Amino acid sequence: TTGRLDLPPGFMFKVQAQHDYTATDTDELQLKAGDVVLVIPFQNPEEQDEGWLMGVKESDWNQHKELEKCRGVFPENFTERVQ
Amino acid sequence: TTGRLDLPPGFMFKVQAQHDYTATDTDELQLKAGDVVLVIPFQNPEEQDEGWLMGVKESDWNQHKELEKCRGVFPENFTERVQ
């Protein structure tokens, strides 16, 4: 895998998981400590819960998987801002 | 199952899970939305991570399971204080 130049629409910033997170639902992102995540906006605010972000793993993004199928929510305090 | 009167040593307060949490490690507590948790102190502070609590599910406690084997850490913002 390479490094794609363009970033997802609405890209805000990059986070790295500091702790594993196991998805409990289909709309959640599964993480491993070390994963880089590209944070993007919620596409519906009524699904937005305090303490949660919406993202797409950098890995998925670089392999050009479709964004609607790969993005998911995760707890902000399992990560820290990077880059 | 009944309602035991005594509370675990160091008991601080009671929380209820607002979202499921799947343990990713043996020292973490597995929760379901609705579970009541009895919050207790960390027995070693070098294992204490910001944003995390130590607890024992009320269910386990009421069935007199051993405390050292049933307690675990969980993310504070998956819960809210009750009672």
Q: Evaluate the radius of gyration of chain A.
A: 12 Å
SSE class of chain A? mainly beta
CATH class of chain A: Mainly Beta
CATH superfamily of chain A: SH3 Domains
Gross morphology of chain A? globular
**Helix proportion of residues of chain A, in percent?**
10-25%
Organism (chains A, B): Rattus norvegicus (Rat)
Protein name (chains A, B): Myc box-dependent-interacting protein 1
Subcellular location (chains A, B): Nucleus; Cytoplasm; Endosome; Cell membrane, Sarcolemma, T-tubule
Could you give a short description of this structure?
The structure is a homodimer of 83-residue chains. With 83 residues, chain A is mostly beta strands.
Question: Could you characterize what this model shows?
Answer:
2 copies of one chain form a homodimer. With 83 residues, chain A is mainly β. The first copy, chain A, has a single domain (1-83), classed as Roll (SH3 type barrels), CATH 2.30.30.40. In chain A, 11% of the residues lie in helices and 28% in strands. The first copy, chain A, has 2 helices and 5 strands; from the N terminus they run βββααββ. Chain A has helices at 58-62, 67-70; strands at 13-17, 36-40, 52-57, 72-75, 79-81. Chain A has a 5-stranded antiparallel β-sheet. The longest helix of chain A is centred in the C-terminal third of the chain and has 5 residues, at 58-62. Chain A is globular and about 30 Å long. It is classed as transferase. The entry lists the keywords transferase, SH3 domain. The assembly is dimeric.
